[PDB]
């Protein structure tokens, strides 16, 4: 129950010990979801880094957004993934929104306020309820077993999630910075706990 | 008798079984026509895909808009075609309007709100009336005999047709998104029937 408007988390150096953990009040099995976030780093030309990592008892990576060297964004909703391609890389803050549903299996990778393509994946798979939502390092277990290679150094914020599939217009409003009501993870009112070397600072990005 | 404003058809994967079919009330032999549509895919760098396919009893391809690898748009009004060239390819939604008349045989390929050139073809040829307007795969017969290579994966919408030759200004208004009255196929009020894996979703493109 705290606000983080105009604030962002900063990871100064690479380390497999520093990370934040977010908690949610979800109780029912997720079937269709959407997420949005902003981040800023420069590790692209050096190695791969983990952007978003979920967690469940049975599977290490229920939902996972990662960056693969010379490949681009990789999005996994289970034991499968899509390989979204990015030809060139620049240095600047980046927004990214994604959505998925079990009924159809479609996915949309909204990047910088623009769409890429609709693609199909894991039609029928139902997501779990209990989670350990870590941020800072990808985990291969319930909040543990981190590898320093995937560690992220830089800053991130503006994280938000919904349990429904947003229409193609509310994404534009999110991109423009308007007022809306997340139902799972709300940046306006959030609960978290942090360990290691992490700091909170005004978002340098616009 | 249904509306599809702000909606679009989505083909998730490649398959020669999924397709939609549109019906029209035409009764007289078409002599001059015009069409307009919007589509979005990324198959250009991989193979050729069929954009629009007509059908008649005597000829498999009465009217056909196709994309040829490293060549560009190909437009056939019968046993003849024009080879419209596109030097470079990008990834983004695309509009395309075309028109033809039997009296003169001229053709205009309006792309992204811009013209290319006037060219001549099949002056005298009269089009048929009965049709099987398929969308999703090119057909070499009356609605049958599909080849998976030509299948389209992506999304498409905003389809409209007229039985006259529009002046160079109404095309601009179409491009800007204004209200007009198609006389053959009307996106505002349309009849269709779909088979296979196809979905209806809000148009991600603007």
């Amino acid at each position, epitope marked *: 129950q705290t606000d983080m408007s105009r604030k962002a988390f900063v990871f100064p150096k690479e380390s497999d010990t520093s990370y934040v953990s977010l908690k949610a009040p979800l109780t029912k099995p997720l079937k269709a979801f959407t997420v949005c976030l902003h981040f800023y780093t420069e590790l692209s030309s050096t190695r*791969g880094y*983990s952007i978003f990592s979920y967690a469940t008892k049975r599977q*290490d*990576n229920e939902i*996972l957004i*990662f960056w*693969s*060297k*010379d*490949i681009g964004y*990789s999005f*996994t909703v289970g*034991g*499968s*993934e*899509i*390989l979204f*391609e990015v030809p060139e890389v620049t240095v600047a803050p980046v927004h990214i929104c994604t959505s998925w549903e079990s009924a159809s299996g479609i996915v949309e990778f909204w990047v910088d306020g623009k769409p890429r393509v609709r*693609k199909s994946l894991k039609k029928g798979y139902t997501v779990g309820a209990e989670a350990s939502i870590i941020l800072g390092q*990808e985990q*291969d277990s319930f909040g543990g077993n981190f590898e320093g290679s995937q560690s992220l150094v830089g800053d991130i914020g503006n994280v938000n999630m919904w349990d429904f599939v947003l229409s193609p217009d509310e994404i534009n409003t999110i991109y423009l910075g308007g007022p809306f009501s997340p139902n799972v993870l709300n940046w306006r009112a959030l609960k978290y706990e942090v360990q290691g070397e992490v700091f909170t600072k005004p978002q340098l990005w616009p | 008798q249904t509306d599809m404003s702000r909606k679009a058809f989505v083909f998730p*994967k*490649e398959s020669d079984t999924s397709y939609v079919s549109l019906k029209a009330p035409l009764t007289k032999p078409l002599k001059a026509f015009t069409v307009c549509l919007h589509f979005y895919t*990324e*198959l250009s*760098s*991989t*193979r050729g895909y069929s954009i629009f396919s007509y059908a008649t009893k005597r000829q498999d391809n009465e009217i056909l808009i196709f994309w040829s690898k490293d060549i560009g748009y190909s437009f056939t009004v019968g046993g003849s075609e024009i080879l419209f060239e596109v030097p470079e390819v990008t990834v983004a939604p695309v509009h395309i309007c075309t028109s033809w008349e039997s009296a003169s045989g001229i053709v205009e390929f309006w792309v992204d709100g811009k013209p290319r050139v006037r060219k001549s073809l099949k002056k005298g040829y009269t089009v048929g009336a009965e049709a099987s307007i398929i969308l999703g795969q090119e057909q070499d017969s009356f609605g049958g005999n599909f080849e998976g290579s030509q299948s389209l*994966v992506g999304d498409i919408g905003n389809v409209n047709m007229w039985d006259f030759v529009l002046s160079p200004d109404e095309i601009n208004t179409i491009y800007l998104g204004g209200p007009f009255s198609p006389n053959v196929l009307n996106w505002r009020a349309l009849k269709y029937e779909v088979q296979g894996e196809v979905f209806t979703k809000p148009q991600l493109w603007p």
Partner: nanobody, 114 residues
């Protein structure tokens, strides 16, 4: 869980080469590719075939080889051409499903006769 390779090194400067790989698993939902490991440096990615109708290519070697995705079987191809001296080294090949699970291949060495 399994992997097999077929190819030869000792190739002359500029000529072609055909390498191949096989496994005991379907390729549906498995992006398969090739990585290069020259002396020193580090194991890098030559090029791979996406899951659905696309082929990523290593920036270093543009228009260098072809992914030649196999279907119904496991037989990846490169169609080497314009073999230059810098091509010498190990050529790893593997299929990775999801990050942290790639079941690394064994790779095959290739030399460049001057």
């Amino acid at each position: 869980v399994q992997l097999v390779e077929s190819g030869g090194g000792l190739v002359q400067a500029g000529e072609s080469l055909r390498l191949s790989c096989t496994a005991s698993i379907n390729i549906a939902g498995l992006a398969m590719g090739w990585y290069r490991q020259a002396p020193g440096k580090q194991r890098e990615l030559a090029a791979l075939s996406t899951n659905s109708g696309t082929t990523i290519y290593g920036n270093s070697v543009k228009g260098r080889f072809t992914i030649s995705r196999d279907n119904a079987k496991k037989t990846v191809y490169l169609q080497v051409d314009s073999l230059k001296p810098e091509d010498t080294g190990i050529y790893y090949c593997n299929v990775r499903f999801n990050p942290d699970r790639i079941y690394w291949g064994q790779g095959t060495q290739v030399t460049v006769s001057s």
